[PDB]
Amino acid sequence: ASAYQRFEPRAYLRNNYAPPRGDLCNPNGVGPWKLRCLAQTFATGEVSGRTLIDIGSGPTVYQLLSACSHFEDITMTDFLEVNRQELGRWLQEEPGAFNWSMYSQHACLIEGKGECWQDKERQLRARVKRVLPIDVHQPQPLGAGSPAPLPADALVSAFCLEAVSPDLASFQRALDHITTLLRPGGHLLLIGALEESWYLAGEARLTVVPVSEEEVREALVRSGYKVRDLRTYIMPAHLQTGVDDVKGVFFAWAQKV
Amino acid sequence: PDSAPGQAAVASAYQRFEPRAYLRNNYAPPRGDLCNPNGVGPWKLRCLAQTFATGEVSGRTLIDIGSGPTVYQLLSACSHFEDITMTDFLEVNRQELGRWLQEEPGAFNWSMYSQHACLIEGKGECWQDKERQLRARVKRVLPIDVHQPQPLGAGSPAPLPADALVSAFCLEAVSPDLASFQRALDHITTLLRPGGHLLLIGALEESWYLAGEARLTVVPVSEEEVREALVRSGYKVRDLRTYIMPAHLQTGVDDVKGVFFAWAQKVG
Ligand SMILES: Nc1ncnc2c1ncn2[C@@H]1O[C@H](CSCC[C@H](N)C(=O)O)[C@@H](O)[C@H]1O
Ligand SMILES: Nc1ncnc2c1ncn2[C@@H]1O[C@H](CSCC[C@H](N)C(=O)O)[C@@H](O)[C@H]1O
Ligand SMILES: Nc1nc2ccccc2[nH]1
Ligand SMILES: Nc1nc2ccccc2[nH]1
C-alpha cells in the first residue's frame, strides 16, 4: 500500500481523463462507454433511494454525474488526503480545480433531458454532503462512528478494488468489506480494469490484480449479489498509451440479496 | 415615397454599432443563459432544430442575411447545407466573424450555444465537432445591403439562386417603416430559388435597441404584419410562432415585446 503514498492526483488525471482517453467526441471511446453504462442504468428507475456512497473516489467525479439526480445525500471517499483535497477544489470551485465540464456536457447529452451542464454540476456539488477517509481493507471501511448515513441505499465504485488488492482473494475480501455498507436490496454499480497488472501516477507505480469478467461475476455472487448486468469494453490500440497495461473495462450492476 | 432619406438615416446610425456591446447585450446572460428551458435562447435554437429535423429543408447552398457578429442561427443548419454564405452590412461585423472562423481566443465564445444545439438535436454530437463543421461549411463572408434591388450586388461570388435563406433580427432592425421592410423582404427573396425555404427570426413590437454608444431605431411589427409581408412576397407560411419576452429578460437593452420565428417556402 505504501506505493500509494507517491500517488500524484494531477498525473493520474492527465493519464486517464485528458485526451486521448478523455476525448469524448468519439462515441466509440472509453469515456462515452462508461457514461453510457451509468446513465442507462439509472434511467431504468430501479436504482433509487436517499443516500449513496462512492467508494475510492480518488480525484474524479465523472462516476457520479448521472447518479446525482437520483440521490439527495452523497458521500465521496478516498484513502489519500491529496485526493480528498483535489475533490474539495472541484466541489468548492477553488482555483486550479480539474475541468470536468466535457464529462458533464456528455452526461447531459446522453441523458437526453435537455439539461445544461452547469445545472448538472450544480446538483452534484449540492448533493455531495461529505468527503471521508476510507480503507476497503478494513472490516469497517469507514471506521466506527462515521458521519456517513448507514446503511447506504446504493454504492458506486470505479477502478478501486482491483487497484488496491494484491490478488483475487484480497479483491474478494475488499468487496465483502464494502458490501457491509450497503442495505439489503441495495444496488452496487462497479467499474474496473480487466486483466491489468500495473498503472502509473506520476512518481508512483501501482500494482493491480489482473481480473477477468468471469472472475468479477463470481466475486459478486460470492459476496451475495444478484448480477443484473455485466458488460465489457475492449480497449482499442489507440487508447493503450503506456500509462498502464489495461486490456478492457468492465461495468457491473449488482443488487444485494 | 422617397426611400433614400430613411435609408441614409439607418446607414448613418449603424456607423456607431459596436459588435462586442451588441453580443454582450443579447448573447450573454441573462438573455444568453441557456439553462432555463423557458428562456428566449433555447426557444430560438429549438425552433431552428425542429425545423431542420423535418428533413424538409435541405439542398446545397444557404445564405444567411444580415449575420452581424453571430453564428447561433446556423448551428442546426450547417449539417444540411454544404455551402454557406454569411453576410453583413458592416465591416466590423464581418471582422468579428473572421475572428471566430480563425478560431481565435479573442473571438466571442459561442460554445454554450453550440452545446445546447447538440443537446436538443439529440444525435450525441460533441460541440467541438459541430463548430468544426460550421467553420468548414462557411465558404465566404460578403457585404450586403437588403435595401438594394440586388442585395449582394451585381455578379456576386455567392452561388445563386440559393436553396435556402436564414435571417435573424435584420429586416426590422434596418427598415424605417413597414413599406421598407416589405421591399427588403422582396429584395432578399430574389436570392432564393422557387420552392426554396426561408427561416426568418425577428423582434415583435420593438422600436429601439442598443449596441454600445449606438441607439438604433427599429420598425415595430406584429405577427400578422409579418405573416402578410411573407404572403405579399410570394411565400407560403409553413410555421409562424411567437415567443413572449418575460419581464426578467427586459434588461433595458431594447424594448422588444416578443420574438417571432417564421418558416416560409417560396411559391414556384
Ligand atoms: N486501502 C484502500 N481503500 C479504499 N481506496 C484506496 C485504498 N488504497 C488506495 N485507494 C484509492 O483507490 C483509488 C484507485 S484510482 C480510481 C479513482 C476514481 N474512482 C476513478 O474512477 O478514476 C485511488 O484514489 C487510491 O487513492
Ligand atoms: N442595409 C442593410 N442590409 C443588410 N444588413 C444590415 C443593413 N444595415 C445594418 N445591417 C445589419 O443588420 C444587423 C442587425 S443585428 C442582428 C445580427 C444577427 N443576425 C443576430 O441574429 O443577432 C447588424 O449586423 C447590422 O450591421
Ligand atoms: N484508473 C483508470 N481510469 C481509466 C479511464 C479509461 C481507461 C482506463 C482507466 N484506468
Ligand atoms: N438583435 C436581437 N437578438 C436577440 C436575442 C434575444 C431577444 C431579443 C433579441 N434582439
CA distance A20 to A5: 27
For residue B29, the distance in angstroms to the closest alpha carbon of chain A comes to 13
Nearest CB to B126: which of A25, A115, A118? Answer: A25
Interface test with B, best of A103, A105, A109 (most B CBs within 10 A): A109
Here the cell at position B234 is 410570394
Give Cα B228 distance to the centre of its chain.
19
CA distance A50 to B182: 60
Q: Is B103 left (phi over 0), alpha (psi -120 to 50) or beta?
A: left
Closest-CA residue of A relative to B35 is: A116
Which amino acid is it at B155? Answer: G
- Specify the CATH number of the domain B1-268: 3.40.50.150
Nearest residue to B245 (alpha-carbon basis) of B253, B233, B256: B256
Domain map (residue ranges) of chain A: 1-257
CA distance A247 to A211: 10
8 A C-beta contact, residue B205 and residue B222: yes
CA distance A171 to A160: 10
Q: Quick check: CB of A58 below 6 Å from ligand 1?
A: yes
8 A C-beta contact, residue A194 and residue A188: no
Separation of B26 CA from ligand 4 center, angstroms?
5
DSSP letter at A2 equals G
Q: Quick check: CB of A60 below 6 Å from ligand 3?
A: no
What resolution in angstroms does the PDB record give?
A: 2.0
8 A C-beta contact, residue B208 and residue B13: no
CA dist B101 to A130, B106, B140, B157, Å? Answer: 45, 11, 10, 19
For residue A20, is the peptide bond before it cis, meaning its omega torsion is within 30 degrees of 0?
A: yes
Kindly give the number of the ligand 4 atom that is closest to the alpha carbon of B40: 6
Contact A109 B120 (CB under 8 A): no
Separation of A171 CA from ligand 1 center, angstroms?
13
CA distance B71 to B79: 14
CA dist A8 to A13, A74, A206, B11, Å? Answer: 9, 25, 11, 61
What is A186-255 written as a DSSP string?
A: EEEEEEEEES--EEEETTEEEE-----HHHHHHHHHHTTEEEEEEEEEEPPGGG--SSB---EEEEEEEE
Fold observed for domain A1-257: Rossmann fold (3.40.50)
CA distance B21 to B238: 34
Report the residue count for chain A: 257
Nearest CB to B119: which of A27, A32, A108? Answer: A108
Q: What's the first-to-final CA gap in chain A, in angstroms?
A: 31
The count of C-alpha atoms lying within 13 angstroms of the C-alpha of B119, restricted to the half-sphere facing its C-beta, is 23
Continuous segment of H or E residues that includes residue A39: helix A30-43
For residue B130, the distance in angstroms to the closest alpha carbon of chain A comes to 10
> Which of helix, strand or coil describes residue A171?
helix
8 A C-beta contact, residue B243 and residue B40: yes
> Which residue stretches of chain B are H helix?
4-13, 19-27, 40-53, 91-101, 111-121, 127-137, 171-174, 178-189, 223-232
CA distance B121 to B111: 15
> Which of helix, strand or coil describes residue B28?
coil
8 A C-beta contact, residue B180 and residue B236: no
With 0-12 / 13-18 / 19 or more C-beta atoms within 10 angstroms meaning exposed / middle / buried, residue A138 is exposed
Query: Number of A:B CB contacts under 8 A?
Result: 31
Q: Quick check: CB of A160 below 6 Å from ligand 1?
A: yes
Closest-CA residue of B relative to A36 is: B124
CA distance A33 to B37: 28
8 A C-beta contact, residue B263 and residue B238: yes
8 A C-beta contact, residue B34 and residue B55: no
8 A C-beta contact, residue B191 and residue B157: no
Query: Ligand nearest A53 Cα, by number?
Result: 1
Q: What angle do CA B132, B138, B142 make, to 5 degrees?
A: 150
Q: Is A114 left (phi over 0), alpha (psi -120 to 50) or beta?
A: left
* Chain position carrying cell 455551402: B83
Continuous segment of H or E residues that includes residue A175: helix A168-179
Three-state SS annotation for A65-83:
CCHHHCCCEEEEEECCHHH
Residues 6+ apart with CB under 8 A from B224: none
DSSP letter at A37 equals H
8 A C-beta contact, residue A13 and residue A60: yes
Residues 6+ apart with CB under 8 A from A6: A201, A202, A203, A204
Residues A118/A124/A126/A127 CA torsion (nearest 10 deg): 160
Residues 6+ apart with CB under 8 A from B181: B171, B172, B175, B219, B221, B229
Separation of B33 CA from ligand 4 center, angstroms?
13
CA distance B176 to B166: 21
Residues 6+ apart with CB under 8 A from B135: B101, B103
* Chain position carrying cell 439562386: B161
For residue B120, the distance in angstroms to the closest alpha carbon of chain A comes to 6
8 A C-beta contact, residue B52 and residue B77: yes
8 A C-beta contact, residue A210 and residue A161: no
What residues does B108 pair with on adjacent strands? none
A119 is in an annotated binding site: no
